[PDB]
Amino acid sequence: EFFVNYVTGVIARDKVAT
């Protein structure tokens, strides 16, 4: 699934839109 040199992470859906 793509499109140091890049950032990876994970967040709660409560703030995905913001």
Partner 1 sequence: SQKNGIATLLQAEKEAHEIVSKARKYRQDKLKQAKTDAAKEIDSYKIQKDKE
Q: Which amino acid is at 1?
A: E
Determine if 7 is a binding residue for partner 1 (CB under 8 A): no
Q: How far is the CB of 3 from partner 1 (least distance, A)?
A: 5
Q: How far is the CB of 9 from partner 1 (least distance, A)?
A: 17
Could you list the beta-strand ranges (E) of the chain.
none
* Residue number with CB closer to partner 1 (1 or 14): 1
- Percent helix, strand, coil in the chain, to 5, is 15, 0, 85
Q: Which amino acid is at 9?
A: G
Determine if 8 is a binding residue for partner 1 (CB under 8 A): no
Output the six-digit token pair for 12. Answer: 């709660």
**Which positions touch partner 1 (CB under 8 A)?**
1-3, 5
